[PDB]
Amino acid sequence: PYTVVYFPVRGRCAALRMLLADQGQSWKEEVVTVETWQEGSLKASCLYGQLPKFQDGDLTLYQSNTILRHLGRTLGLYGKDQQEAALVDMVNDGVEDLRCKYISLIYTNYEAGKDDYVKALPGQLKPFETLLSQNQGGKTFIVGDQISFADYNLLDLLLIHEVLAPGCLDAFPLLSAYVGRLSARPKLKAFLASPEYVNLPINGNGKQ
Amino acid sequence: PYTVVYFPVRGRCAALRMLLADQGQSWKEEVVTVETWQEGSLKASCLYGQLPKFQDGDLTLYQSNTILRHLGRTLGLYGKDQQEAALVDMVNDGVEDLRCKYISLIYTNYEAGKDDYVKALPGQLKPFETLLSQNQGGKTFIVGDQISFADYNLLDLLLIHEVLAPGCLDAFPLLSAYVGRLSARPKLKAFLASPEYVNLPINGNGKQ
């Protein structure tokens, strides 16, 4: 019932893929090639002229966060009540905020802005470490005592930054333990080690 | 029970303010002055070091969209089912995407990028006009037959662009009628005419 249409990269699909994997859900992948896109037909049909595009039965969605929230809402990974839902949201926006700057580094001024970015990274990771310390001492998830779509999206964000600035998680013991704890979940662990994940580039231009 | 803490501008608070007004809800405003902020005390306490900050009882939220979704979730402005909820979401992300570039124009290269931005505007407004035509012929709301937080967020976006590039909505008859229809809602109409709204600048640097 699930289908994700995206380029042959992890990018903004990595998280939602971790979500379906870990949740034990089946989905079909529809790879879009640098030519098909450029053929104009696809882009032209995409509401915002962008991928990912996702299909759920008779439902078609665009935008990564819309899909993530959708899966969370339907699969039950959106907090146990409105209050947790709002905090799950708050965490995702923050994640998205950093993802947004990350993407800007990679495709805009990688070579020339990498140093300043890594320098400014701690300042960016602190809020999530802080959020963690305020929830059962950063022992469970980022909000509540049950996993949420924001968890998968944060785990990805953390993961891709360790590749960008290895060790950047040394000074944030709660984030570090969080990455190891979630990364060890049976289905997710298997997924992240699989070729489907491991053999895909993180970004388009090959910069990481 | 509601309190919004923001600078003395409309910016990212305009929409949620329209939401509470139109919904007939009471809230208190806590203005933050260019001096308090820069004192360091506030910023330092803000999860992401940024405003708006919102309070619902002892519940504290940051990020405009988290607040908007929260109000939508608690006030019943989030679609009539999961399906509509996902589309409401999709619309807000798009709105936020254009808002994001708008803000970049205003605070980064207004004078030098204004022409290219207006030139590229139609291309940006089309998706919402298209979304409108596919819902009861753009006669009700942006999703479903009941208003949603995305409605308020889009109305604002349209409203502020009309001031940036007057007439920019003359090419979109469904968007135009949508702006006039919503702007005429009793409570909202009153609010938008009030000094509370009218006497606030749209952005920080006074560029609009």
Side-chain angles (χ1 to χ4, degrees):
Chain A
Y2 297 132
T3 313
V4 352
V5 187
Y6 194 60
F7 309 94
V9 313
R10 289 169 201 163
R12 307 195 156 253
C13 261
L16 60 102
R17 277 157 180 168
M18 281 181 217
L19 193 158
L20 288 163
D22 194 80
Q23 281 312 296
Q25 299 291 303
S26 292
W27 80 99
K28 153 116 221 141
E29 293 260 5
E30 281 192 19
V31 181
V32 165
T33 319
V34 62
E35 262 171 78
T36 306
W37 196 235
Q38 314 202 312
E39 125 214 71
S41 325
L42 245 163
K43 178 170 193 327
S45 44
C46 291
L47 191 66
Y48 303 102
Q50 276 164 11
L51 285 170
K53 166 200 204 119
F54 181 91
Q55 306 186 278
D56 192 339
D58 47 285
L59 216 221
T60 306
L61 278 2
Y62 298 79
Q63 309 273 15
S64 24
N65 304 315
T66 293
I67 291 144
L68 273 166
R69 267 179 190 94
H70 182 66
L71 263 15
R73 201 158 27 227
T74 51
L75 265 5
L77 329 168
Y78 217 146
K80 84 171 188 297
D81 64 22
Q82 296 175 359
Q83 206 157 245
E84 291 205 340
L87 303 174
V88 167
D89 270 340
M90 208 181 69
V91 180
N92 205 78
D93 291 7
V95 170
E96 179 59 26
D97 262 346
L98 188 47
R99 184 178 304 285
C100 171
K101 320 193 167 124
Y102 166 70
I103 292 169
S104 162
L105 177 69
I106 295 304
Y107 305 96
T108 292
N109 65 110
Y110 185 93
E111 278 79 41
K114 201 184 154 54
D115 288 6
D116 316 54
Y117 185 98
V118 166
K119 259 162 208 187
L121 232 192
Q124 301 295 333
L125 295 184
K126 278 179 202 118
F128 302 99
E129 174 68 355
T130 298
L131 258 161
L132 231 23
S133 55
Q134 310 178 331
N135 186 39
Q136 286 200 32
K139 271 351 246 179
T140 36
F141 305 106
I142 200 69
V143 178
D145 65 6
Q146 59 171 75
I147 199 143
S148 75
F149 70 84
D151 275 309
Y152 293 107
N153 199 3
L154 175 66
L155 174 64
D156 182 58
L157 184 68
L158 297 175
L159 283 170
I160 68 180
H161 270 99
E162 297 223 68
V163 178
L164 174 70
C168 70
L169 247 51
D170 282 339
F172 304 110
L174 259 41
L175 283 190
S176 295
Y178 171 77
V179 170
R181 193 189 324 122
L182 295 196
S183 279
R185 291 171 66 101
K187 300 194 205 328
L188 222 201
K189 181 178 210 300
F191 176 72
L192 297 165
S194 79
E196 184 174 350
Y197 175 99
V198 176
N199 283 317
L200 255 45
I202 284 157
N203 299 130
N205 56 1
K207 273 169 188 196
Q208 64 174 26
Chain B
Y2 297 133
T3 309
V4 354
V5 189
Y6 199 59
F7 308 94
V9 309
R10 291 173 200 160
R12 308 193 153 258
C13 270
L16 54 104
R17 276 156 181 170
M18 278 182 220
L19 192 158
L20 291 162
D22 203 51
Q23 282 316 299
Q25 298 297 314
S26 286
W27 81 96
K28 155 108 210 144
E29 296 266 358
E30 277 195 15
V31 180
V32 166
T33 317
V34 64
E35 269 75 38
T36 314
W37 194 235
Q38 320 191 313
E39 204 247 89
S41 332
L42 246 160
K43 183 178 193 315
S45 48
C46 300
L47 192 61
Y48 304 104
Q50 272 161 18
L51 286 165
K53 167 198 202 121
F54 183 88
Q55 301 177 280
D56 198 18
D58 62 19
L59 205 221
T60 307
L61 276 2
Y62 297 83
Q63 310 272 24
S64 32
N65 307 321
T66 299
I67 292 145
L68 269 164
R69 272 177 182 94
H70 182 64
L71 263 10
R73 207 148 32 225
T74 64
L75 259 10
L77 327 169
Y78 216 148
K80 70 165 208 295
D81 58 35
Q82 306 201 30
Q83 193 221 178
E84 295 195 359
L87 309 172
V88 174
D89 264 332
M90 209 175 75
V91 179
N92 207 68
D93 295 11
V95 170
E96 174 61 19
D97 273 300
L98 187 50
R99 179 178 306 285
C100 174
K101 323 190 160 134
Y102 166 74
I103 291 166
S104 160
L105 177 70
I106 299 305
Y107 304 100
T108 283
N109 63 168
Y110 184 90
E111 280 78 42
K114 206 181 140 62
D115 310 282
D116 316 14
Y117 186 98
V118 167
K119 261 164 212 184
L121 233 190
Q124 297 299 340
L125 296 187
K126 278 188 203 110
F128 302 100
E129 172 76 353
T130 298
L131 253 162
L132 229 23
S133 68
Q134 309 173 335
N135 185 39
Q136 292 212 34
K139 271 347 241 173
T140 37
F141 306 106
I142 202 72
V143 178
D145 56 4
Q146 66 174 66
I147 198 148
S148 91
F149 68 88
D151 267 295
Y152 294 110
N153 202 7
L154 179 60
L155 176 69
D156 184 74
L157 184 65
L158 301 174
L159 282 171
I160 68 175
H161 269 103
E162 252 299 355
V163 172
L164 177 67
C168 77
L169 247 47
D170 295 353
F172 306 94
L174 257 38
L175 284 192
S176 291
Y178 172 82
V179 168
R181 192 191 322 131
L182 291 192
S183 285
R185 287 164 73 94
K187 300 195 199 333
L188 226 196
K189 186 178 199 314
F191 176 66
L192 296 165
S194 81
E196 197 183 329
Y197 174 97
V198 177
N199 295 350
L200 252 46
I202 280 148
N203 310 115
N205 42 25
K207 281 173 185 204
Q208 64 170 30

